[model samples]
Target: MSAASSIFDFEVLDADHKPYNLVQHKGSPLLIYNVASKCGYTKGGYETATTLYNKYKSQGFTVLAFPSNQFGGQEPGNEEEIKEFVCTKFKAEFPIMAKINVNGENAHPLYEYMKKTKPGILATKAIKWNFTSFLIDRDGVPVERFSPGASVKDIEEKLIPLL
Candidate 1:
């Protein structure tokens, strides 16, 4: 199969535990990030993403948040609690993926593919921390990988044209 086909083959769960197929967003640019509600960057990062999503959503851009507790036990909660925290606290308008493992042996298949496609600092593929983001072009290919400390505004500049 072609690479783009593999990229769109994922079928992950949403915050509500419903199947969310990435193929539904075919031909759209995507901003996918690993999120932890209790992390220090959570508030500012998510708020920024929400603003960005609202502005470009109608133009074929989407921000996909993937809740993960793999960092510092920051997001220690069930799917229900995670959903409430993101919506009520961050006022997120985008679809939040189910809690996922972005590292180690049990990492989700989609995340493993993303890391392989866009290896991080020093050629390492492991995700360093929460808030790390991957920008995908309309063709479903990884275009850029943002570090955890990278501001959402910085990411926004990279996303504007892709929208």
Candidate 2:
């Protein structure tokens, strides 16, 4: 495949395993996250993610979550199970994509592109943990990389200006 110049250049799978083109979200600021249901950050992260999505969705901000089990096998559920847990436990409404690897050789292309566009602290290309997030501007340019520990407030501060 050729190089991806922006987030819109990639195609990911939805929870149902259908092709979900990123270009469909063009002109919207996006928060892309690698989530894990069994991780320590799961509860708070989901809550914050849901909160952010509800708060900013009307302003053209969208949150796209990709479940991953790479970090200590934290997210082990299948698509239906994962969706039920998230929606029931946290009332999350953002799109939850299909499970995917976020690191190593099998990492998803969207993730690889984000890491390359905005490496983490110390310029690391690998995602350190679940909930690691990439914030994309309206034009689909990755502008910031947020660690798993970054809070809703932290994300909101950067997100507000983009909406």
Candidate 3:
């Protein structure tokens, strides 16, 4: 609402059909990713992201996942099923949001707002692929955008500082 003044201003629905208010993550830095099950980036991002979240979650950092089927039909499942796959397959402990399109007119409202706020490389609003990450600081501002191939280890330095 109101042009998404900040990250906390957006609303993301959980897999359980519950609302995970970004504003409530106020004291913790957020690492939000547009994910896909069969995408190439999922191997590293899903695995390493889970480790990173498990490591830092107790220290005021949380990773939020949004499964998107928009890219190459990679994540082709409903919210509940996607949640199970992430948890069972990769032991992902992060919060997985409801299913959504991460590109074009059908993009989720939160993602639409994030794209506006961070934009992608070359100033494009479209995401090139899945596993694209948006690092949001405790202040509710999206601090940086990481491309799909970005090293998951890089989060230790590039993103952890903002937390």
By TM-score, the best candidate is: 2
- Best lDDT among the predictions, by candidate number: 2
> Which tens-of-lDDT digit does each residue in 19-46 have in candidate 1?
8877778788888888766523453566
Q: Write the per-residue lDDT of candidate 2 for residues 49-114, one digit (tens) a residue.
A: 778888888887889988774443323233445445543222248888887888767777888888
Question: For candidate 2, what is the TM-score?
Answer: 0.80
TM-score of 1: 0.76
What TM-score does each of the candidates earn? 0.76, 0.80, 0.78
Model 2 ranges with Cα > 4 A deviation: 69-91
RMSD of 1: 5.2
Candidate 3, residue 146: Cα displacement in angstroms equals 0.6
What's the ranking of the predictions by TM-score, best on top?
2, 3, 1
